[PDB]
User: Which sequence fits this backbone?
């Protein structure tokens, strides 16, 4: 529920790496293709995310990816606290489901683009705008943040 | 005023290129350092922006940067219409002022980072969160979009 919580995880496709951040309360996704799973790339991604949305806490399914000096520095600078492990019945499998949908969409649009990174961003667009009298992830995140 | 309007412009520093998008109604910025001013880089940036915020119209101070096949394709796919020239007294010099503040902040934090791109993202964070009983650009954009 808390509006400041994001979960970050990397997945691999076509020998490339996709960093996926899910705003847990809304299902909204920010994703980028990165050359390798480095702390450098993770630190940079986090600084960008934090300058765009109010990020209070980051969760992950791989805690070791947040141990590098570069990543610690980014979270320190941006005022981000980390959770040890993952705390919540209301969000059970939400992050799993969102990554599943994103992967599924990427599959559906992949042949329209030359580059995986292009297909990923198309999939992000599609995901964030998809209506479930229901709302999209993009509409949900704005309402959650606006409500303060 | 209209909540779907963004202005995109490139600036150069340290022999590198900074793409800056300002949400005109709020002053909110998304910016990235790109290797060269290519249509490829602009197209990709636009697809990303469009998947994160509701982008209806793009303005620019350099219209030729939106003529390439790649950029036209991105705007077509994302449903983005372009303005010929720039239409508005309420927003007079808003984009100019925001680029000016961003440049000023980049200057203030530049020595804290090795890479320009890092300094740019720190500057974006600082800009978006800065309170002018006033609000920040980040608070303004969410309220504008939430109000529908
Ligand atoms: C929506 C959209 C927008 C542009 C393109 C597109 C790409 C994509 O790569 C980028 C330029 C976006 C980096 C691509 O991967 O095909 C590339 C390499 N070349 C193009 C050439 C002409 C027209 C469009 C594209 C393809 C799609 C599906
Ligand atoms: C807030 C923050 C976060 C991390 C860093 C940082 C960078 C920056 O580059 C990235 C890793 C972010 C790509 C840098 O440009 O200095 C680099 C190259 N190396 C580092 C090594 C150790 C600790 C921090 C950094 C510097 C700052 C100011």
Assistant:
């Amino acid at each position: 529920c808390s509006p400041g919580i994001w979960q970050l995880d990397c997945t691999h496709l076509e020998g490339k790496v996709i960093l996926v951040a899910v705003h847990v309360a809304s299902g909204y996704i920010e994703a980028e293709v990165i050359p390798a799973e480095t702390g450098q790339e993770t630190a940079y991604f986090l600084l960008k995310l934090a300058g765009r949305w109010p990020v209070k806490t980051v969760h992950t399914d791989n805690g070791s990816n947040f141990t590098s000096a570069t990543v610690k520095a980014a979270c320190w600078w941006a005022g981000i606290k980390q959770e040890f492990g993952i705390p919540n019945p209301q969000s059970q499998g939400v992050i799993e489901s969102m990554n599943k949908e994103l992967k599924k969409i990427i599959g559906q649009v992949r042949d329209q683009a030359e580059h995986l990174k292009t297909a990923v961003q198309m999939a992000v667009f599609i995901h964030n705008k998809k209506r479930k009298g229901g709302y999209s992830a993009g509409e949900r995140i704005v309402d959650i943040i606006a409500t303060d």
